[PDB]
């Protein structure tokens, strides 16, 4: 019974006190209405005293204890003040409003928790939101209200004056916007004395009886006045006064007191609704706590390498990073890298390019085979029996061989270019992977990679050109054709193995080794470390936020464990 419902709301109160209100939905009741709706007078009727316009949400926590009427104000600036008097409450509230908003009429999403424990106030926790009305100001108010009412865990409480058509009210309009079904919307009609025509009377009479699709229905209460702040009427006598009013009323007596009550059972209705709602939303709340904790933990696992700790753990950290980087580079060189689905390794791509090279060599081999075939076939029969000196050229075939070799120069260089490109790309990718968060270090590494790439490229091209220079400068009608064909085959093989050897050696092994040695060379300057390991200064703030979030969530789990016990 009572012993079940009190700690029930105490749990959620404790959760919001340490909220944990962010990044997850938390059960609450939001009071929404126009500035002239008089919702403050209703809150005054419930708590005993309220503001005579709020700028920031007021977390009204009411407790019913047969000890004494005591009140404590808790402010988001991590402060707490014991005023022990209802009168001082509104003044200190206004002080807090001045603190949070900025002395003037501003707006803030920061919470003011009002903890009032009294034997004359119903046990109920509800949240008061600022009144409605490019931009100007009211826009951010509607945004603030939307922040709450959009949640399914938030019960809408619309406050509507009796002297206005409820179907044209902005509060109920927004409530319908976020809840078209009306499954979590409660409507209270206030200021029944302020109306001045029978028209409004019967309109209220047909409104109290479900005409609008609100599952929770409607209730009608007396404002008790917002202008009479100092009169200070007792809650019991105020209740009796309201009962007297509705009972004396020609229409409202029989039609309301028999059905939807007018007597301050509103707080009891809100109590029951809050209990049932919380009981409904508890499992998903626990689930979301665990899940959010997991996601925060993972996102935090993605970034954590920050602690320097007297430079030693920092230089050691740098050593670790460079070590891992060099390891991955070595993996790239050896072809022992981890790739994604349908993704191929660098070394394999390079091997494909080598296959292309082999194909080209075969093509040109057959070509020059045909060429020298026709040459030998022709000039061995040319002037076969002419008395001259002879013997129809011999130095000439060498320039044919020269053509055969020369045609291979540019394709090889092109292959070298491609290899250097893709390898460069891979190295840059690794450099980005290991040094993403660190901009300066990444710049240094990439610059180094660029330089070494250029140097080894020059070396490789020089060695290729050297190879071709060596190939050129060094040396029964169709016997010669056979000889030269054999020569072409052997040369084809020799090049087919030689050029990929050069490309692999200079672009993979030597490049990788030089890169690693340069990486080791980097950490030689100690006083440069701080410049190297400079974070974004955005990831740090994010890290702090995630850490605080996780801490708060662990506190939530702890409190939940206490409640379950």
The residue range among 108-116, 374-382, 389-397, 487-495 that interacts with its own copies, by the rule CB under 8 A, is 487-495
At its nearest, how many Å lie between its own copies and the CB of residue 498? 7
Distance, CA of 547 to CA of 535 (rounded, Å): 17
Picking from 130, 114, 183, the residue whose alpha carbon sits closest to that of residue 153 is 183
Question: Counting contacts by CB under 8 A, is residue 355 touching its own copies?
Answer: no
Paired tokens of 448:
């180094």
Nearer residue to its own copies within complex by CB, 367 or 509: 509
Question: Counting contacts by CB under 8 A, is residue 505 touching its own copies?
Answer: yes
How far the first Cα of the chain sits from its last, in Å, is 18
The residue range among 56-64, 81-89, 178-186, 500-508 that interacts with its own copies, by the rule CB under 8 A, is 500-508
Q: What is the dihedral of CA 249, 255, 258, 261, to 10 degrees?
A: -70
The residue range among 13-21, 73-81, 450-458, 464-472 that interacts with its own copies, by the rule CB under 8 A, is 464-472
Distance, CA of 555 to CA of 551 (rounded, Å): 6
Out of 202, 425, 497, 562, the only residue in the binding site for its own copies (CB under 8 A) is 497
Nearer residue to its own copies within complex by CB, 137 or 399: 399
Question: Counting contacts by CB under 8 A, is residue 402 touching its own copies?
Answer: no
Nearer residue to its own copies within complex by CB, 241 or 351: 351
Picking from 442, 453, 559, 444, the residue whose alpha carbon sits closest to that of residue 508 is 453
Out of 338, 385, 473, 561, the only residue in the binding site for its own copies (CB under 8 A) is 473
Question: Counting contacts by CB under 8 A, is residue 251 touching its own copies?
Answer: no
At its nearest, how many Å lie between its own copies and the CB of residue 509? 5
How many helices and strands, by DSSP H and E, does the chain display? 18, 9
Question: Counting contacts by CB under 8 A, is residue 401 touching its own copies?
Answer: no
Paired tokens of 498:
């030689």
Question: Counting contacts by CB under 8 A, is residue 455 touching its own copies?
Answer: no
Phi, psi of 269 (to 5 degrees): -60, -45
Question: Counting contacts by CB under 8 A, is residue 312 touching its own copies?
Answer: no
Residue 496 DSSP SS3: helix
Out of 494, 526, 547, 558, the only residue in the binding site for its own copies (CB under 8 A) is 494
Question: Counting contacts by CB under 8 A, is residue 212 touching its own copies?
Answer: no
At its nearest, how many Å lie between its own copies and the CB of residue 479? 21
Nearer residue to its own copies within complex by CB, 412 or 445: 412
Paired tokens of 491:
């040369």
Nearer residue to its own copies within complex by CB, 389 or 474: 474
The residue count for binding its own copies (CB under 8 A) is 19
356 burial class (0-12, 13-18, 19+ CB within 10 angstroms)?
A: middle
Angle in degrees, 0-180, between the axes of helices 312-334 and 511-522, rounded to the nearest 10: 180
Question: Counting contacts by CB under 8 A, is residue 483 touching its own copies?
Answer: no
At its nearest, how many Å lie between its own copies and the CB of residue 320? 28
Question: Counting contacts by CB under 8 A, is residue 350 touching its own copies?
Answer: no
Place of tokens 């509705």: 246
Question: Counting contacts by CB under 8 A, is residue 471 touching its own copies?
Answer: yes
Residue 166 DSSP label? G
Residue 184 DSSP label? S
Out of 439, 501, 531, 551, the only residue in the binding site for its own copies (CB under 8 A) is 501
Those residues whose C-beta lies under 8 Å from the C-beta of residue 166, and which sit 6 or more positions away, are 160, 172, 187, 189, 207, 212
Question: Counting contacts by CB under 8 A, is residue 470 touching its own copies?
Answer: yes
Nearer residue to its own copies within complex by CB, 164 or 502: 502
Picking from 24, 505, 5, the residue whose alpha carbon sits closest to that of residue 289 is 24
The residue range among 324-332, 491-499, 524-532, 535-543 that interacts with its own copies, by the rule CB under 8 A, is 491-499
At its nearest, how many Å lie between its own copies and the CB of residue 466? 8
Residue set of the binding site for GTP? 33-40, 128-132, 190-193
Question: Counting contacts by CB under 8 A, is residue 47 touching its own copies?
Answer: no
Out of 241, 509, 542, 557, the only residue in the binding site for its own copies (CB under 8 A) is 509
Q: In angstroms, what CA-CA distances link 226 with 37, 40, 70, 128, 236? A: 10, 7, 23, 16, 18
Picking from 149, 159, 129, 125, the residue whose alpha carbon sits closest to that of residue 275 is 125
Distance, CA of 436 to CA of 201 (rounded, Å): 70
Out of 37, 504, 514, 516, the only residue in the binding site for its own copies (CB under 8 A) is 504
Q: What is the dihedral of CA 378, 379, 380, 383, to 10 degrees?
A: 110
Nearer residue to its own copies within complex by CB, 50 or 346: 346
Question: Counting contacts by CB under 8 A, is residue 490 touching its own copies?
Answer: yes
Kindly report the number of other CB atoms within 10 A of residue 184's CB atom: 22
Alpha helices (H) along 435-538: 439-473, 479-504, 511-522, 529-532
Question: Counting contacts by CB under 8 A, is residue 353 touching its own copies?
Answer: no
At its nearest, how many Å lie between its own copies and the CB of residue 473? 5
Out of 318, 401, 408, 502, the only residue in the binding site for its own copies (CB under 8 A) is 502
Q: Return the exposure string of 61-96: e unless at least 16 CB atoms fall within 10 Å of the residue's CB, then b.
A: bbbbeeeeeebbbbbbeeeeeebeebebbbebbeeb
Residue set of the binding site? 33-40, 128-132, 190-193
Question: Counting contacts by CB under 8 A, is residue 558 touching its own copies?
Answer: no
Nearer residue to its own copies within complex by CB, 288 or 485: 485
At its nearest, how many Å lie between its own copies and the CB of residue 471? 7
Residue 510 DSSP label? I
At its nearest, how many Å lie between its own copies and the CB of residue 496? 9
Nearer residue to its own copies within complex by CB, 271 or 491: 491
Q: Are 80 and 29 in contact (CB under 8 A)?
A: no
Out of 402, 469, 483, 547, the only residue in the binding site for its own copies (CB under 8 A) is 469
Where along the sequence are the contacts to its own copies (CB under 8 A)? Answer: 463, 466, 469-471, 473-474, 490-491, 493-494, 497-498, 500-502, 504-505, 509
């Amino acid at each position: 019974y009572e012993q079940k419902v009190r700690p029930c709301i105490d749990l959620i109160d404790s959760l919001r006190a340490l909220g944990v209100e962010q990044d997850l939905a938390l059960p609450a009741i939001a009071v929404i209405g126009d500035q002239s709706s008089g919702k403050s007078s209703v809150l005054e009727a419930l708590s005993g005293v309220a503001l005579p316009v709020t700028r920031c949400p007021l977390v009204l926590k009411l407790k019913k204890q047969p000890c004494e009427a005591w009140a404590g104000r808790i402010s988001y600036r991590n402060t707490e003040l014991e005023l022990q008097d209802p009168g001082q409450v509104e003044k200190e509230i206004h002080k807090a409003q001045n603190v949070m908003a900025g002395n003037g009429r501003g707006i803030s999403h920061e919470l003011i928790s009002l903890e009032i424990t009294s034997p004359e106030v119903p046990d109920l926790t509800i949240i008061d939101l600022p009144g409605i009305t490019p931009r100007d100001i009211g826009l951010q108010i509607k945004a603030l209200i939307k922040k709450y009412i959009q949640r399914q865990q938030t019960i809408n409480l619309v406050v509507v004056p009796c002297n206005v058509d409820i179907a044209t009210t902005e509060a109920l309009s927004m409530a319908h916007e976020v809840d078209p079904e009306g499954d979590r919307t409660i409507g209270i009609l206030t200021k029944p004395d302020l109306m001045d025509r029978g028209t409004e009377k019967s309109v209220m009479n047909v409104v109290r009886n479900l005409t609008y699709p609100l599952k929770k229905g409607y209730m009608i209460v007396k404002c008790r006045g917002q202008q009479e702040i100092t009169n200070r009427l007792s809650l019991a006598e105020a209740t009796k006064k309201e009962i007297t009013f509705f009972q004396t009323h020609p229409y409202f007596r029989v039609l309301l007191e028999e059905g939807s009550a007018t007597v301050p059972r509103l707080a009891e209705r809100l109590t029951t609704e809050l209990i049932m709602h919380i009981q409904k939303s508890l499992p998903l709340l626990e689930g979301q706590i665990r899940e959010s904790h997991q996601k925060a933990t993972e996102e935090l696992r993605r970034c954590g390498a920050d602690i320097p700790s007297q430079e030693a753990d920092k230089m050691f950290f740098l050593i670790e990073k460079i070590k891992m980087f060099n390891q991955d580079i070595e993996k790239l060189v050896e072809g022992e890298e981890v790739v994604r689905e349908n993704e191929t390794r660098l070394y394999n791509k390079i091997r494909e390019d080598f296959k292309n090279w082999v194909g080209i060599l075969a093509t040109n081999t057959q070509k020059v085979k045909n060429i020298i075939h026709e040459e030998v076939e022709k000039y061995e029969k040319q002037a076969a029996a002419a008395e001259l000196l002879g013997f129809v050229n011999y130095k000439t075939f060498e320039i044919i061989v020269h053509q055969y070799i020369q045609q291979l120069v540019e394709p090889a260089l092109s292959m070298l270019q491609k290899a250097m490109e893709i390898i460069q790309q891979a190295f840059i990718n690794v450099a980005k992977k290991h040094f993403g968060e660190f901009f300066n270090l990444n710049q240094t590494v990439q610059s180094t990679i660029e330089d070494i790439k250029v140097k080894h490229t020059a070396k490789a091209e020089n060695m290729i050109q050297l190879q071709f220079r060596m190939e050129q400068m060094v040396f029964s009608f169709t016997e010669i054709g056979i000889h030269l064909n054999a020569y072409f085959l052997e040369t084809s093989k020799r090049l087919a193995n030689q050029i990929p050897f050069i490309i692999q050696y200079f672009m993979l092994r030597e490049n990788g080794d030089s890169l690693q040695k340069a990486m080791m060379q980097i950490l030689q300057e100690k006083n440069r470390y701080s410049w190297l390991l400079q974070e974004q200064s955005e990831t740090a703030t994010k890290r702090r936020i995630l850490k605080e979030r996780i801490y708060r969530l662990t506190q939530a789990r702890h409190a939940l464990c206490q409640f379950s016990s």
